């Protein structure tokens, strides 16, 4: 019975409470405008509760509170991402930083990638809804190619300096590349920003659209045969699924990174409930 362990126990259970609430927001076909808003609240609550836990874990380290051998056996179940015969104080510190780096440099990375790509695909879906106003039938089908390319080109522009990672500032090539491999070379692309690098959104799906439109020819508005229209729309709809699957990929990488962080808490919570 120690106040620091009790306050830690309760803070960790409040984390597992937020983790579950975030798993709900992440399992929905549509990540609406509100979905990102909810994801932000839970993330900010996790961040400040992890900060409180660290401050509590710090107390336990400097005071060298014992971690019984019956409890050190449970820290083996901690995910290998946590990086867990060492001193009592060194192990409490080896946790406060573990739980803190699992959030800043691991969990929150997937969070921003999701939001960055969610915003991008949200704005693209607006181009999708506005296609009704750029396609007129007469078979015959008139297409406002210029208006559509301008829309897609300004989508690329609006997100050139909004990378999947990092959220702020830059990182090293070996750091941008190491995260590119985890997210996917098809969803992102390392890019130079000022002196360092980032993991920018990969806009190849939109680039492919612009190439297909340039191939339709014409000098502005283009009238297609019925077969030439179903052909274009098929490739334009296939690129839509590519981005929709790219986003589903990030969501799973995020919810899985949450399940890991959650088990790092489940293990920790059971490690203090004993000691």
């Amino acid at each position, epitope marked *: 019975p120690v106040s620091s362990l009790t306050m830690l126990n309760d803070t960790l259970h409040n984390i597992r409470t937020t983790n579950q609430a975030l798993k709900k927001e992440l399992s929905q076909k549509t990540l609406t405008k509100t979905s990102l808003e909810e994801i932000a609240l839970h993330s900010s609550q996790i961040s400040m509760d992890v900060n409180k836990s660290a401050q509590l874990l710090d107390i336990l380290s400097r005071n060298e509170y014992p971690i019984n051998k019956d409890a050190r056996e449970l820290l083996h179940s901690a995910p290998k991402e946590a990086e867990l015969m060492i001193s009592h104080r060194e192990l409490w510190a080896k946790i406060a930083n573990s739980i803190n780096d699992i959030n800043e440099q691991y969990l929150k990375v997937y969070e921003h990638a999701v939001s960055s790509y969610t915003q991008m695909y949200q704005d*693209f*879906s607006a*181009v999708l*809804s*506005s296609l009704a*106003g750029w396609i007129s039938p007469g078979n015959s089908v008139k297409l406002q190619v210029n*208006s559509l390319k301008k*829309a897609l080109e300004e989508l690329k522009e*609006k997100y050139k300096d909004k990378p999947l990672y990092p959220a702020n500032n830059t990182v090293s090539q070996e750091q941008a590349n190491k995260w590119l491999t985890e997210l996917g070379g098809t969803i992102g692309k390392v890019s130079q920003k000022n002196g360092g690098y980032v993991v920018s959104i990969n806009m190849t799906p939109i680039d492919n659209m612009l190439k297909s439109l340039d191939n339709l020819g014409g000098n502005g508005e283009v009238v297609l045969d019925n077969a030439k229209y179903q052909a274009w729309n098929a490739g334009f709809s296939a690129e839509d699924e590519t981005m929709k699957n790219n986003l589903q990929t990030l969501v799973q990488k995020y919810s899985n990174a949450n399940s890991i962080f959650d088990n790092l808490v489940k293990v920790l919570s059971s490690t203090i409930s004993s000691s």
Partner: nanobody
Framework: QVQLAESGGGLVQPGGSLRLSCSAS????????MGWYRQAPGKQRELVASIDSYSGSITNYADSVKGRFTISRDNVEKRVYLEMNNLKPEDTAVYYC?????????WGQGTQVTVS
């Protein structure tokens, strides 16, 4: 070039509400960030609501307006809306609608909104 035209103004009593509407015609409506402005007699122009291009997820309002106005956009029909609830006398002004993207800016003539 984009042509803007606002409609829906008029006289209301304090606590009343309006449905301000701006219809656009011309360029690519979807790429422009929209924003409603107002200028009361004598006083200086003011930004009241703003919405970004495309889906329009990002919106912020002036402190004197939050919770009462709401800005939305219809890319399909190419119109910008500003529903105004619980209107106060200080909300009296000519409300203009702005389409903006980098240095590109387009304006409608604006509607009068009087609350008394």
């Amino acid at each position: 070039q984009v042509q803007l035209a606002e409609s829906g103004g008029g006289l209301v009593q304090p606590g009343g509400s309006l449905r301000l509407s701006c219809s656009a015609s011309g360029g690519v409506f979807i790429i422009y960030n929209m924003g409603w402005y107002r200028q009361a007699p004598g006083k200086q122009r003011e930004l009241v609501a703003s919405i970004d291009s495309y889906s329009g997820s990002i919106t912020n309002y002036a402190d004197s307006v939050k919770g009462r106005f709401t800005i939305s956009r219809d890319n399909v029909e190419k119109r910008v809306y500003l529903e105004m609830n619980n209107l106060k006398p200080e909300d009296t002004a000519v409300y203009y609608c702005n389409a903006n993207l980098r240095t590109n800016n387009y304006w409608g003539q604006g509607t009068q909104v009087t609350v008394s």
